[PDB]
Design a protein around this ligand. Sequence first.
Ligand SMILES: CSc1ccccc1CC(=O)N1C[C@@H](C)C[C@H](C(N)=O)C1
Ligand SMILES: [Zn+2]
Length: 139
Amino acid sequence: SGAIYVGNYRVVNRHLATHNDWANLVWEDSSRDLLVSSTTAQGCDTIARCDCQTGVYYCSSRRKHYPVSFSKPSLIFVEASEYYPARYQSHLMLAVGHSEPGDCGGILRCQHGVVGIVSTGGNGLVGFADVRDLLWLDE
Ligand SMILES: CSc1ccccc1CC(=O)N1C[C@@H](C)C[C@H](C(N)=O)C1
Ligand SMILES: [Zn+2]
């Protein structure tokens, strides 16, 4: 679990969005596993606008943060799950690090701000949905 709170927006994994997220929908994209909903309270986070490929993510299944080197956002095949059919997920960045399904939502940050959230993983892999291209989250 986990969310980014920026301005009057809440960014979550689309597959973990609540009834309230859908009732306050701003934008969603199944191909990116992202959903953004509106909030009444002002957020606590700021978004990176950069090309970093290193950062630190929060891993809930270890109650710890880990440093990572990750690929640039790209279109990557993701096998079928309970939430989606087998498909290509776009704007996904992969890295070597620990993750389990419940780790989705953990934030990845670089020195400039929030980069994205955990969205996929595998045997010693962790994948992050990028949010740096969503300029309207502040603008
Ligand atoms: C951190 S998720 C994870 C970690 C280790 C092993 C397996 C997973 C599960 C995983 O990759 N997916 C299943 C589900 C959570 C939806 C995800 C998606 N964005 O399509 C894909
Ligand atoms: Zn950066």
